[PDB]
Design a protein around this nucleic acid. Sequence first.
RNA 1: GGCUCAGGACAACGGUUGCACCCCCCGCGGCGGUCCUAGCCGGACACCGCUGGCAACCCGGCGCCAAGACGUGCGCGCAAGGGCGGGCGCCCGGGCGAGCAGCGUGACGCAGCGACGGCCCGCCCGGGCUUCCGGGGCAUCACCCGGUCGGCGCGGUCGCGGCGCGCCGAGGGCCCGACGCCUGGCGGAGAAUCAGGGUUCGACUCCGGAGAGCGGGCCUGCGAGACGGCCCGCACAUCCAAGGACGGCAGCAGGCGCGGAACUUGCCCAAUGCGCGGCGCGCGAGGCAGCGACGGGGAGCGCGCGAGCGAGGCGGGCCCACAGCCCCCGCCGCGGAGCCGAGGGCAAGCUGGUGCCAGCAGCCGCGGUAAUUCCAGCUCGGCGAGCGUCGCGCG
Lengths: 167, 258, 216
Amino acid sequence: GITHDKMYKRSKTGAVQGKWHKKRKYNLGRQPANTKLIVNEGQKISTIRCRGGNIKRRALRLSHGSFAWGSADISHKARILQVVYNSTSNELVRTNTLVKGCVVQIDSAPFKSALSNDTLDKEILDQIRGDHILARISSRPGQVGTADGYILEGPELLFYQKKLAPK
Amino acid sequence: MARGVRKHLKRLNAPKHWLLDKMGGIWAPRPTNGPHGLRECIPLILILRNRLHYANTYAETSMILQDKNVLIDGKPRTDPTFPVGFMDVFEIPKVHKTFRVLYDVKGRFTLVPIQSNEAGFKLCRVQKIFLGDKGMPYLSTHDARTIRFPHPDIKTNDTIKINLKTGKIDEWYKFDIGKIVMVTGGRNCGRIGTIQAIDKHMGSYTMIRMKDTEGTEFLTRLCNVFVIGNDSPAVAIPTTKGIRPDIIKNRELRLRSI
Amino acid sequence: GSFCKVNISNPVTGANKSLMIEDFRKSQTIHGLRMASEFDGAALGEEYAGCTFRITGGNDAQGFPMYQGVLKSQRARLLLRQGAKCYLHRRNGERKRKSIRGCIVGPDLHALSVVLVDAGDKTLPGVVPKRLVPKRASKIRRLFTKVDPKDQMLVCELIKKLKYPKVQRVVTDEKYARKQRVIAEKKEIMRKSLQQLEEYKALLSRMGKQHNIRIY
RNA sequence: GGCUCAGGACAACGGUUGCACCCCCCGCGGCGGUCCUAGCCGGACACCGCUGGCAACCCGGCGCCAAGACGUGCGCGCAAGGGCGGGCGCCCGGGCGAGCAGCGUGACGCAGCGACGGCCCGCCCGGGCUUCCGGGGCAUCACCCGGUCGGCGCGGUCGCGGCGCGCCGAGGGCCCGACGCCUGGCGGAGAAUCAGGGUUCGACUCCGGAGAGCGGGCCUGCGAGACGGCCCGCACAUCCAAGGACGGCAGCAGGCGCGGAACUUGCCCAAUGCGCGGCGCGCGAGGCAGCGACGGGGAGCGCGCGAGCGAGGCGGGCCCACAGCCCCCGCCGCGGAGCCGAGGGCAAGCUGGUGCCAGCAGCCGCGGUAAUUCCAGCUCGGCGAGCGUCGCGCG
Ligand SMILES: [Mg+2]
Ligand SMILES: [Mg+2]
Ligand SMILES: [Mg+2]
Ligand SMILES: [Mg+2]
Ligand SMILES: [Mg+2]
Ligand SMILES: [Mg+2]
Ligand SMILES: [Mg+2]
Ligand SMILES: [Mg+2]
């Protein structure tokens, strides 16, 4: 089936190497999970029997995740609203597909329920008084079956704000 | 490429220092995994059948072992392919024979008979220190044994004395210049000498220079240098004291024995 | 040929009987019925009138059994997994493709398996005997929880040599003692490890340590 | 384990590194704390009984019963993953050459073990990839490559990686022979030949690789893209009571075809080992026997003026899993040499025929009336249980 063996490629000179054996099971790959944001329907996670009896779980649908505000040391479980930016391609954004590095909007309730009363960074607080907070994804859905991340801070926040503001 | 692990062993592909006849058969015993590896071990049946001669076939050895007639480090072993290695204790109470497995100068395994006072322990080489679960310090040895909570004063390549009945450390010998050692690998297996120099190369092997009692000097890598005491051996050693004669003297000895 | 051997089985008394049918027109009402479907016995009025029957299985004229959810009047092939019906496996992951008759009933059948669920008051040629006795402790205790004695009966059945099934799930001295010894061993092991940790920590007063602090 | 060498020419393979980018059954040694009826839990199937279909292969329905089988699960917080936690030019413990491991703490999630206690860690064998060097011929193949070269990001993988996808840039190789084509191309340890330097070969005993009619796909499992495992297409082949069913000797014997060329459809696990297992079973692996002028080694067809010894036969031992064979002991006692040549190279010559005919002759040459060379007899020479002819390699 799908394989990642290098025998089917060309050489550094651009030559055809040739083939000397049939396909092997060590060098196989699998179809992508394509984890979807929920926005019969519910959280669905599958399990994969990998080499050595090891277990791998890929998420197909999920709606929640753990997010951390590093500067203030605040962490809660929050609901993810939608994906708003992705560097690889805009098609993933349109489909609300979750991958590592996606930029998402989370609900503000778990944070505002305790914030807006202590001196901290102005920008995060302005986000808090609203409905959503900009954030990022740091885990790998499709390998561990989870979608965690962290709240954006300084220069990267400015970068992404300037990116998505005109839209 | 074989689809799995290997279970057989051709006789011609067996280690040389086992001394197996070419015409004995197509096959040789395949040792099972255990305290020692394939190339640093010798199966029990070879000792029990081709040396001591208490058995003449595989079957007799099987009966003897399954009747519990040999103890290895205080534990009865019923496997004819169990691996025996260096500085192991071989006791047969039915005949009051006790042997310690060591190396001869020629580079082969030999049985040195011992006493009762020194058969309650063995020497082990520590070559790995690591943190296990929960950050608990650990320590491993050449015979595939691990000990938890070792003394901080014990470092790598040191030598450790452990009681056979209880795997508890008593005293330890450091790896240092001026300590008697015994070579356990390569061209110089079975030689005994004292460390004179230590030279390290970043990212490569560390070479140890040793001098024999007679003034001969030889070199070997640190991976097969075993400490056996502080200037004097801690255990009984073969009749010869780790002296390898030259071909001329060996020929003279052969002619004398002829 | 043109016929169908109907086999009737009685689960309440464990009696089974078979009969012969040489017609289809009388049995047209049997056509179009699926497995696990009530089938009034009026088709065979004499001796089987006023009785409700359920269709359980059958075999077509070539011998192919009938599968469940096929929903067809004709046999077909499918890949059968291990542990499914009408397939005896050889290895532990082997599959096999074979032909099976469709669940829907039709003239093509040569056999029928049916059961009696509700009947009238009339007697029919078609009590349940028992060939074996319950073996687990719970079963026999039910038929002559938290039962301290754990004793039991032994009258059983005799055939001369007396033969009775051995009782299972019974705890006496050996099992109780074994469990208690195992518990004591585990407690001793935990205590020894804790003591070793404590003395190691007491040592190293002149150095640093890192271990997983026990929470709770 | 056993068979074979089709395919594959910066590959496989050989030596030398590495994983601080990895996985691993048995075995050995440790470790063993589990959030929210425990005198012992629940329901089934197999074998089996009754009733049945079909030519065969194959199975159906009903029914009581077991588990070191399946499910649930008694318990001192514990799987994967995720955020935060070092410096001020550099260097001078858990551990390294190397900031690598572990731990704490804020949030998520309740994975595995537990109705006779094993989740986890280390070692070991094995595997996967990877650095450096070596790794066929043709220039009547001189320019080649376009995921081809690199970068960023995600995905997938046991895992690194153009391995795959999106975007960006343009690159990479070449007379120190690229690219293409051919091979009656598996590689090495090694074999033949013989002053020294070398030439040719390397199916086959050990190691490594690849395959099981061709081409693909997959389940089980630590481990197979396995074929004495399953699914499909193609090419073949088989049984059918014509609706259906079924197969893969490059495993051991045996058969057809092909070819210049190649053996018994034998007996046994007693030995060496492997699998399971306590006083053992099985194994066409392997061993024993049979055919066998591939070939290698050792004796002999006489010595002597009479004695002696072989082969061979009839019996007894030894050996053997059973039997042969060798060897030993007794009574009778089958003594058999061919293949080449006799002008030179090259050691070895006498009559009768034929008449440039028939024929010899590796080369030179003979034969048209003595033929020292043809065909025959005598004699002689070489090697010898072996001799000669054909093809190939070395010399
Ligand atoms: Mg609980
Ligand atoms: Mg259970
Ligand atoms: Mg070929
Ligand atoms: Mg091979
Ligand atoms: Mg294969
Ligand atoms: Mg296959
Ligand atoms: Mg076959
Ligand atoms: Mg096979």
